[PDB]
Curated annotation (Swiss-Prot):
Disulfide topology: 65-159, 105-118, 105-120
Reported modifications of this chain: Alternate disulfide bonds occur in equal amounts in all variants examined.
Keyword set includes Plastid: no
GO molecular function: identical protein binding; long-chain fatty acid binding; retinol binding
Subunit structure: Under physiological conditions beta-lactoglobulin exists as an equilibrium mixture of monomeric and dimeric forms. Interaction with LMBR1L which mediates the endocytosis of LGB has been observed in PubMed:17991420, but not in PubMed:23964685.
Locations listed in the record: Secreted
UniProt name for this protein: Beta-lactoglobulin
Keywords: Allergen, Disulfide bond, Milk protein, Retinol-binding, Secreted, Signal, Transport
Function in brief: Primary component of whey, it binds retinol and is probably involved in the transport of that molecule.
Entry's Gene Ontology cellular component terms: extracellular region
Annotated source species: Bos taurus
Record family assignment: Belongs to the calycin superfamily. Lipocalin family.
Length: 161
């Protein structure tokens, strides 16, 4: 689905702290409740030396904010990782400048029109208008039906409460 990938991605340089400033999905149900399936809040990226990606994040489940750890495995495409879970879940890095913003989408492997969610990550708990502008331009193709964004207070709280 996603026709935008970052050329020349250096996965080591995305290490460190990130904030999920905005999210969007193809289906309202993927993001509507606090416990919605792709309502996830990125905490940090931890690239391994072989070039896989450990992801720390928070997710609300059963009435509280839970910390999760995910391994995205590398593929032959530098910008595309596989989540390793039951669903053939692919993560694509659309664009990043390493020091300010990273845009990524995650999609299901097939069925036929399928689930897709994308986030605008930023390095600091600040509304970055230019990064949100790149996020919205990246998505104006994609068939999104829900979009969320968060204010700096929420960005400093667990599960953006
Ligand atoms: C590649 C650099 C960008 C960072 C990508 C972050 C991708 C989160 C992927 C999370 C997928 C959904 C997790 C669902 C909760 C875990 C579970 O229920 O098993």
């Amino acid at each position: 689905i996603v026709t935008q990938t970052m050329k020349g991605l250096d996965i080591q340089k995305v290490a460190g702290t990130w904030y999920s400033l905005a999210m969007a999905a193809s289906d309202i149900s993927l993001l509507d409740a606090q416990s919605a399936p792709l309502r996830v809040y990125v905490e940090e990226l931890k690239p391994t030396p072989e070039g896989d990606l450990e992801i720390l994040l928070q997710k609300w489940e059963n009435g509280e904010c839970a910390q999760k750890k995910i391994i995205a495995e590398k593929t032959k495409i530098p910008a595309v990782f596989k989540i390793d879970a039951l669903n053939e879940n692919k993560v694509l890095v659309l664009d990043t400048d390493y020091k300010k913003y990273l845009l990524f989408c995650m999609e299901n492997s097939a069925e036929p029109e399928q689930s897709l969610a994308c986030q605008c990550l930023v390095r600091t708990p600040e509304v970055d208008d230019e990064a949100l502008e790149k996020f919205d331009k990246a998505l104006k193709a994609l068939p999104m039906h829900i979009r969320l964004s968060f204010n700096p207070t929420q960005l400093e709280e667990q599960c953006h409460i």
